[PDB]
Design a protein around this ligand. Structure first.
Ligand SMILES: O=S(=O)(O)CCCN1CCN(CCO[C@@H]2O[C@H](CO)[C@@H](O)[C@H](O)[C@H]2O)CC1
Ligand SMILES: [Cl-]
Ligand code: NA
Length: 472
């Protein structure tokens, strides 16, 4: 029983637009912040790589559907490129080519019995909107609503699973470093918090828009995808446990407390620590933006499920480190990783499968057991089809998730592997491979070929259980 997926549980795979599509300036698509970063700042990216072509999924979407069908995916999570649909960011111009492209992909998926799950925003902001300041500028919340309206109107008759945003914990960090994630702006502890504030507002507007303009007719569900690492106390002390709770609230709670709790607002520890630190450093005003009571009420409850992106764990101990000002310093935890944990091809990613079960329980307890859809989980290597590390990563994480479901009563409703195929891994270029399908980036045809992990995942999806040879 503990090895069997619930009957209604949805299994599949995931991608994101900039990471796979290419066709960066084709047929009316406007420029986004990742076009800008990779073109203007190739020194920020391994190999000076760009997403100009990537997997060429703009042209090769039928091949993506073919491999999803081979895999036996029930659901395909993909993102829509804002600047492909609205090249100017604002909704004055709708690019029919972009509408046609996503309709073509959606229709191809449905014709092959695969359900689309659409992420509206997976990091590729139109440059025209970044030029207003991007996410720190609250005007983007209305722009986001208008973008979502176009998506719901055009695609919502066939798409019943939506994520407003993918992992704003990461993309807010594009406003906390001059050399990091797009748009690579150095306003740590200030602009990243403003970005988070706008995103939360935007998410809430999009959810209310769905309620007001689309839900009665379309009958779908709207969530948000949040990335969170498990944070394990470095020792069993109360003080180290406090530091790990700080971590959860500063990383997951920053977004999830306003939306998924009955109280709403930011977590108290976030408000209080930032207020204190801001005062001690001489600011008249806290660096953390505030919600009014009306805004708190508007934002809380804006969810039909919680998307979780889970990859790894950290150790946390009591203390403070990091630069002043910064979110890490404000969070009041000292983070490390255990040397004993198995490694990947990504410095940040260690294999800690039991951390997944711990995190699912933390979420259950904090947010009253919301329906949780695992929108990303996966593992990097540098190449190869006999990807034993990836196979082990998936079988262990899926076992831990199944224990969370069956033993712990966590309402997990679906799981999409990150990623369907090797793709453009942001600042790591094509150097780190997360796919279950390999892609030859030196071959203009970009063939997708199954790794051992794709074969094992297909077996899991077909049998709806963890095969005996992978059980404890
Ligand atoms: O090495 S450093 O410590 O100097 C920088 C680390 C930056 N992290 C990397 C991991 N990412 C996880 C969630 O982000 C996910 O990560 C996947 C794999 O990376 C991406 O492909 C997906 O687009 C994304 O949603 C959050 C940001
Ligand atoms: Cl066997
Ligand atoms: Na339209």
């Amino acid at each position: 029983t503990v090895y069997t997926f619930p009957d209604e549980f949805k299994l599949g795979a995931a991608t994101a637009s900039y990471q796979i599509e290419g066709a960066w300036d084709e047929n009316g698509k406007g420029p986004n912040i990742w076009d800008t970063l990779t073109h203007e700042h190739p020194d920020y990216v391994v190999d000076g790589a760009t997403g100009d072509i990537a997997d060429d999924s703009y042209h090769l979407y039928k091949e993506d559907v073919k491999i999803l069908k081979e895999l036996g995916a029930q659901v395909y999570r993909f993102s829509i490129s804002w600047a492909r649909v609205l090249p100017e960011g604002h909704d004055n111009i709708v690019n029919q080519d972009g509408i046609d492209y996503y309709n073509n992909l959606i229709n191809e998926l449905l014709a092959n019995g695969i359900e689309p799950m659409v992420t509206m925003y997976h990091w590729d902001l139109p440059q025209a909107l970044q030029d207003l300041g991007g996410w720190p500028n609250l005007v983007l919340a209305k722009y986001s609503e208008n973008y979502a309206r176009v998506l719901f109107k055009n695609f919502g008759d066939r798409v019943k699973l939506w994520l407003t945003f993918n992992d704003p914990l990461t993309f807010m960090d594009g406003y906390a470093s001059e050399i990091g994630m797009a748009p690579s702006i150095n306003t740590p502890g200030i602009g990243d918090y403003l970005a988070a504030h706008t995103v939360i507002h935007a998410h809430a507007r999009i959810y209310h828009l769905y309620d007001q303009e689309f839900r009665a007719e379309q009958g779908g569900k709207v969530g948000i995808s949040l990335n969170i690492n498990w944070c394990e106390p470095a020792t069993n002390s109360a003080e180290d446990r406090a530091s790990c709770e700080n971590y959860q609230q500063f990383n997951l709670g920053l977004y999830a407390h306003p939306i998924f709790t009955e109280e709403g607002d930011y977590p108290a520890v976030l408000k209080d620590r930032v207020s204190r630190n801001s005062a001690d450093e001489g600011y008249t005003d806290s660096r953390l933006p505030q919600f009014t009571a009306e805004e708190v009420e508007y934002i809380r409850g804006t969810h039909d499920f919680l998307g979780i992106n889970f990859y790894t764990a950290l150790l946390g101990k009591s203390g403070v480190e990091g630069y002043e000002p910064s979110r890490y310093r404000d969070s009041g935890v000292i983070l490390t990783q255990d040397a004993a944990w198995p490694i990947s091809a990504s410095s940040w990613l260690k294999v800690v499968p039991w951390g997944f079960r711990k995190e699912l329980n933390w979420i259950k307890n904090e947010y009253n057991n919301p329906p949780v859809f695992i929108t990303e989980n996966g593992f990097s290597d540098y190449g190869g089809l006999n990807d034993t590390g990836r196979v082990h990563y998936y079988t262990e994480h899926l076992k831990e998730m199944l224990k969370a479901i069956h033993e712990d009563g966590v309402n997990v409703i679906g799981y999409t592997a990150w990623s369907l195929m090797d793709n453009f891994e942001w600042l790591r270029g094509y150097s780190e491979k997360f796919g279950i399908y390999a892609v030859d980036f030196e071959d203009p045809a970009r063939p997708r070929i199954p790794k051992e992990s794709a074969k094992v995942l297909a077996e899991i999806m077909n049998t709806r259980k963890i095969p005996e040879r992978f059980r404890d």
